[PDB]
């Protein structure tokens, strides 16, 4: 896989980010994660964590997987990095998202994210408390 730069337009919520990617605005859905909705327990925390990780970063990068690059809603599907740290992974590591929507073709980082979720769950952290 490879990491491409992008410029932040809007950190939308826990699972999506709007970026200027090669000069065009697109909404990216984070691969492999599902975040509690804002009006559910941990929703507001999970959303603010995601937003601030992205917004505080100097460098934002997009990393497409080996399968489809857009979902059935027209969203880009990617791993997003914030100063070299994977946003998808951190959300899960901190017990503020769950590993989810793991399709063939776009599962490169599945083992890594499941490792993070296992640590969160062992620690009974946040959604796992
Ligand atoms: C993460 C991800 C979500 N999606 C779609 C599947 C879900 O649609 P369906 O429920 O219609 O299947 C939806 C979940 O996204 P949200 O969690 O943003 O709603 O996003 C994909 O198609 N591929 C993906 O990799």
PDB file of C-alpha atoms and ligand atoms in Angstrom:
ATOM      1  CA  UNK A   1       0.000   0.000   0.000  1.00  0.00           C
ATOM      2  CA  UNK A   2       1.029   3.593  -0.238  1.00  0.00           C
ATOM      3  CA  UNK A   3       0.350   6.795   1.619  1.00  0.00           C
ATOM      4  CA  UNK A   4      -0.712   9.903  -0.279  1.00  0.00           C
ATOM      5  CA  UNK A   5      -0.870  13.410   1.100  1.00  0.00           C
ATOM      6  CA  UNK A   6      -4.224  15.192   1.457  1.00  0.00           C
ATOM      7  CA  UNK A   7      -5.373  18.492   2.917  1.00  0.00           C
ATOM      8  CA  UNK A   8      -8.065  18.669   5.561  1.00  0.00           C
ATOM      9  CA  UNK A   9     -11.300  20.360   4.625  1.00  0.00           C
ATOM     10  CA  UNK A  10     -13.565  19.173   7.502  1.00  0.00           C
ATOM     11  CA  UNK A  11     -13.253  16.581  10.231  1.00  0.00           C
ATOM     12  CA  UNK A  12     -16.849  15.524  10.060  1.00  0.00           C
ATOM     13  CA  UNK A  13     -17.415  12.885  12.756  1.00  0.00           C
ATOM     14  CA  UNK A  14     -15.992   9.667  14.184  1.00  0.00           C
ATOM     15  CA  UNK A  15     -15.962   7.792  10.886  1.00  0.00           C
ATOM     16  CA  UNK A  16     -15.627  10.349   8.087  1.00  0.00           C
ATOM     17  CA  UNK A  17     -13.303  13.104   7.077  1.00  0.00           C
ATOM     18  CA  UNK A  18     -13.553  15.535   4.154  1.00  0.00           C
ATOM     19  CA  UNK A  19     -10.220  16.039   2.426  1.00  0.00           C
ATOM     20  CA  UNK A  20      -8.865  17.816  -0.629  1.00  0.00           C
ATOM     21  CA  UNK A  21      -7.359  14.875  -2.473  1.00  0.00           C
ATOM     22  CA  UNK A  22      -5.432  15.754  -5.651  1.00  0.00           C
ATOM     23  CA  UNK A  23      -7.371  19.005  -5.873  1.00  0.00           C
ATOM     24  CA  UNK A  24     -10.874  17.624  -5.408  1.00  0.00           C
ATOM     25  CA  UNK A  25     -13.054  17.472  -2.256  1.00  0.00           C
ATOM     26  CA  UNK A  26     -13.961  14.001  -1.090  1.00  0.00           C
ATOM     27  CA  UNK A  27     -15.533  12.374   1.877  1.00  0.00           C
ATOM     28  CA  UNK A  28     -13.510   9.382   3.173  1.00  0.00           C
ATOM     29  CA  UNK A  29     -15.064   6.678   5.333  1.00  0.00           C
ATOM     30  CA  UNK A  30     -12.418   5.154   7.604  1.00  0.00           C
ATOM     31  CA  UNK A  31     -11.788   1.449   6.773  1.00  0.00           C
ATOM     32  CA  UNK A  32     -12.464  -1.315   9.268  1.00  0.00           C
ATOM     33  CA  UNK A  33     -14.070   0.716  12.044  1.00  0.00           C
ATOM     34  CA  UNK A  34     -17.451   1.448  13.455  1.00  0.00           C
ATOM     35  CA  UNK A  35     -17.867   4.234  15.965  1.00  0.00           C
ATOM     36  CA  UNK A  36     -20.811   4.667  18.349  1.00  0.00           C
ATOM     37  CA  UNK A  37     -23.225   7.303  16.984  1.00  0.00           C
ATOM     38  CA  UNK A  38     -23.041  10.767  18.605  1.00  0.00           C
ATOM     39  CA  UNK A  39     -26.270  10.260  20.626  1.00  0.00           C
ATOM     40  CA  UNK A  40     -25.113   6.869  22.017  1.00  0.00           C
ATOM     41  CA  UNK A  41     -22.854   6.317  24.977  1.00  0.00           C
ATOM     42  CA  UNK A  42     -19.253   7.294  24.145  1.00  0.00           C
ATOM     43  CA  UNK A  43     -20.528   8.956  20.933  1.00  0.00           C
ATOM     44  CA  UNK A  44     -19.357  12.456  21.781  1.00  0.00           C
ATOM     45  CA  UNK A  45     -16.040  11.381  23.134  1.00  0.00           C
ATOM     46  CA  UNK A  46     -15.426   9.059  20.158  1.00  0.00           C
ATOM     47  CA  UNK A  47     -16.227  11.812  17.682  1.00  0.00           C
ATOM     48  CA  UNK A  48     -14.120  14.516  19.396  1.00  0.00           C
ATOM     49  CA  UNK A  49     -11.137  12.074  19.679  1.00  0.00           C
ATOM     50  CA  UNK A  50     -11.244  11.425  15.933  1.00  0.00           C
ATOM     51  CA  UNK A  51     -11.727  15.061  14.997  1.00  0.00           C
ATOM     52  CA  UNK A  52      -8.917  16.384  17.182  1.00  0.00           C
ATOM     53  CA  UNK A  53      -6.402  13.694  16.105  1.00  0.00           C
ATOM     54  CA  UNK A  54      -6.994  14.816  12.490  1.00  0.00           C
ATOM     55  CA  UNK A  55      -7.301  18.558  13.151  1.00  0.00           C
ATOM     56  CA  UNK A  56      -4.178  18.683  15.380  1.00  0.00           C
ATOM     57  CA  UNK A  57      -2.005  16.908  12.838  1.00  0.00           C
ATOM     58  CA  UNK A  58       0.403  18.755  10.547  1.00  0.00           C
ATOM     59  CA  UNK A  59       0.455  15.993   7.980  1.00  0.00           C
ATOM     60  CA  UNK A  60      -2.685  14.087   6.853  1.00  0.00           C
ATOM     61  CA  UNK A  61      -2.262  11.057   4.533  1.00  0.00           C
ATOM     62  CA  UNK A  62      -4.682   8.735   2.761  1.00  0.00           C
ATOM     63  CA  UNK A  63      -3.920   5.052   2.176  1.00  0.00           C
ATOM     64  CA  UNK A  64      -6.218   3.098  -0.100  1.00  0.00           C
ATOM     65  CA  UNK A  65      -6.400  -0.678   0.364  1.00  0.00           C
ATOM     66  CA  UNK A  66      -6.223  -3.320  -2.440  1.00  0.00           C
ATOM     67  CA  UNK A  67      -9.971  -3.530  -3.117  1.00  0.00           C
ATOM     68  CA  UNK A  68     -12.594  -0.954  -3.873  1.00  0.00           C
ATOM     69  CA  UNK A  69     -11.653   2.671  -3.339  1.00  0.00           C
ATOM     70  CA  UNK A  70     -15.199   3.973  -2.967  1.00  0.00           C
ATOM     71  CA  UNK A  71     -18.136   2.545  -1.070  1.00  0.00           C
ATOM     72  CA  UNK A  72     -21.722   2.060  -2.221  1.00  0.00           C
ATOM     73  CA  UNK A  73     -22.444   5.639  -0.900  1.00  0.00           C
ATOM     74  CA  UNK A  74     -19.723   7.296  -2.946  1.00  0.00           C
ATOM     75  CA  UNK A  75     -17.297   7.723  -0.022  1.00  0.00           C
ATOM     76  CA  UNK A  76     -13.621   7.056  -0.426  1.00  0.00           C
ATOM     77  CA  UNK A  77     -12.522   4.065   1.606  1.00  0.00           C
ATOM     78  CA  UNK A  78      -9.144   4.523   3.269  1.00  0.00           C
ATOM     79  CA  UNK A  79      -6.751   4.335   6.171  1.00  0.00           C
ATOM     80  CA  UNK A  80      -6.100   7.886   7.365  1.00  0.00           C
ATOM     81  CA  UNK A  81      -2.815   8.891   9.060  1.00  0.00           C
ATOM     82  CA  UNK A  82      -2.269  11.903  11.262  1.00  0.00           C
ATOM     83  CA  UNK A  83       1.465  12.721  11.630  1.00  0.00           C
ATOM     84  CA  UNK A  84       2.204   9.105  10.843  1.00  0.00           C
ATOM     85  CA  UNK A  85      -0.263   7.609  13.300  1.00  0.00           C
ATOM     86  CA  UNK A  86      -3.142   5.624  11.961  1.00  0.00           C
ATOM     87  CA  UNK A  87      -6.447   7.238  12.973  1.00  0.00           C
ATOM     88  CA  UNK A  88      -8.390   4.021  12.332  1.00  0.00           C
ATOM     89  CA  UNK A  89      -6.065   2.098  14.712  1.00  0.00           C
ATOM     90  CA  UNK A  90      -6.000   4.717  17.504  1.00  0.00           C
ATOM     91  CA  UNK A  91      -9.833   4.921  17.698  1.00  0.00           C
ATOM     92  CA  UNK A  92      -9.932   1.213  18.248  1.00  0.00           C
ATOM     93  CA  UNK A  93      -6.890   1.110  20.624  1.00  0.00           C
ATOM     94  CA  UNK A  94      -8.625   3.610  22.906  1.00  0.00           C
ATOM     95  CA  UNK A  95     -11.925   1.691  23.064  1.00  0.00           C
ATOM     96  CA  UNK A  96     -13.726   4.388  21.058  1.00  0.00           C
ATOM     97  CA  UNK A  97     -14.493   2.294  17.989  1.00  0.00           C
ATOM     98  CA  UNK A  98     -14.885  -1.363  17.121  1.00  0.00           C
ATOM     99  CA  UNK A  99     -13.391  -3.352  14.273  1.00  0.00           C
ATOM    100  CA  UNK A 100     -16.205  -3.740  11.731  1.00  0.00           C
ATOM    101  CA  UNK A 101     -17.100  -3.930   8.057  1.00  0.00           C
ATOM    102  CA  UNK A 102     -14.158  -6.162   7.264  1.00  0.00           C
ATOM    103  CA  UNK A 103     -14.590  -7.121   3.611  1.00  0.00           C
ATOM    104  CA  UNK A 104     -12.236  -9.165   1.426  1.00  0.00           C
ATOM    105  CA  UNK A 105     -10.071  -7.081  -0.767  1.00  0.00           C
ATOM    106  CA  UNK A 106      -9.814  -4.253   1.798  1.00  0.00           C
ATOM    107  CA  UNK A 107      -8.475  -5.995   4.917  1.00  0.00           C
ATOM    108  CA  UNK A 108      -4.741  -5.304   4.942  1.00  0.00           C
ATOM    109  CA  UNK A 109      -4.745  -3.805   8.403  1.00  0.00           C
ATOM    110  CA  UNK A 110      -7.260  -6.184   9.934  1.00  0.00           C
ATOM    111  CA  UNK A 111      -4.788  -8.049  12.122  1.00  0.00           C
ATOM    112  CA  UNK A 112      -3.255  -4.819  13.412  1.00  0.00           C
ATOM    113  CA  UNK A 113      -6.628  -3.315  14.270  1.00  0.00           C
ATOM    114  CA  UNK A 114      -7.829  -6.529  15.950  1.00  0.00           C
ATOM    115  CA  UNK A 115      -4.698  -6.451  18.072  1.00  0.00           C
ATOM    116  CA  UNK A 116      -5.579  -2.921  19.179  1.00  0.00           C
ATOM    117  CA  UNK A 117      -9.172  -3.916  19.937  1.00  0.00           C
ATOM    118  CA  UNK A 118      -7.962  -6.896  21.995  1.00  0.00           C
ATOM    119  CA  UNK A 119      -5.762  -4.531  24.079  1.00  0.00           C
ATOM    120  CA  UNK A 120      -8.701  -2.098  24.587  1.00  0.00           C
ATOM    121  CA  UNK A 121     -11.010  -4.952  25.554  1.00  0.00           C
ATOM    122  CA  UNK A 122      -8.446  -6.549  27.971  1.00  0.00           C
ATOM    123  CA  UNK A 123      -8.106  -3.125  29.624  1.00  0.00           C
ATOM    124  CA  UNK A 124     -11.927  -2.787  29.701  1.00  0.00           C
ATOM    125  CA  UNK A 125     -11.426   0.598  28.217  1.00  0.00           C
ATOM    126  CA  UNK A 126     -14.273   3.002  27.446  1.00  0.00           C
ATOM    127  CA  UNK A 127     -16.854   1.084  25.254  1.00  0.00           C
ATOM    128  CA  UNK A 128     -15.453  -2.158  26.800  1.00  0.00           C
ATOM    129  CA  UNK A 129     -15.912  -0.898  30.437  1.00  0.00           C
TER     130      UNK A 129
HETATM  131  C1  LIG B   1     -16.359   0.847   6.502  1.00  0.00           C
HETATM  132  C2  LIG B   1     -17.284   0.585   5.321  1.00  0.00           C
HETATM  133  C3  LIG B   1     -18.563   1.005   5.315  1.00  0.00           C
HETATM  134  N1  LIG B   1     -19.275   0.734   4.206  1.00  0.00           N
HETATM  135  C4  LIG B   1     -20.635   1.029   4.151  1.00  0.00           C
HETATM  136  C5  LIG B   1     -21.293  -0.296   4.561  1.00  0.00           C
HETATM  137  C6  LIG B   1     -22.424   0.174   5.381  1.00  0.00           C
HETATM  138  O1  LIG B   1     -23.537   0.318   4.515  1.00  0.00           O
HETATM  139  P1  LIG B   1     -24.811  -0.580   4.711  1.00  0.00           P
HETATM  140  O2  LIG B   1     -25.250  -0.403   6.143  1.00  0.00           O
HETATM  141  O3  LIG B   1     -25.756  -0.042   3.667  1.00  0.00           O
HETATM  142  O4  LIG B   1     -24.201  -1.885   4.283  1.00  0.00           O
HETATM  143  C7  LIG B   1     -22.064   1.591   5.798  1.00  0.00           C
HETATM  144  C8  LIG B   1     -21.648   1.759   7.186  1.00  0.00           C
HETATM  145  O5  LIG B   1     -21.155   3.083   7.146  1.00  0.00           O
HETATM  146  P2  LIG B   1     -21.538   4.039   8.289  1.00  0.00           P
HETATM  147  O6  LIG B   1     -21.085   3.265   9.556  1.00  0.00           O
HETATM  148  O7  LIG B   1     -20.760   5.306   7.986  1.00  0.00           O
HETATM  149  O8  LIG B   1     -22.988   4.228   8.226  1.00  0.00           O
HETATM  150  O9  LIG B   1     -20.934   1.994   5.070  1.00  0.00           O
HETATM  151  C9  LIG B   1     -18.817  -0.051   3.099  1.00  0.00           C
HETATM  152  O10 LIG B   1     -19.558  -0.302   2.105  1.00  0.00           O
HETATM  153  N2  LIG B   1     -17.564  -0.490   3.056  1.00  0.00           N
HETATM  154  C10 LIG B   1     -16.818  -0.206   4.112  1.00  0.00           C
HETATM  155  O11 LIG B   1     -15.697  -0.632   4.072  1.00  0.00           O
END
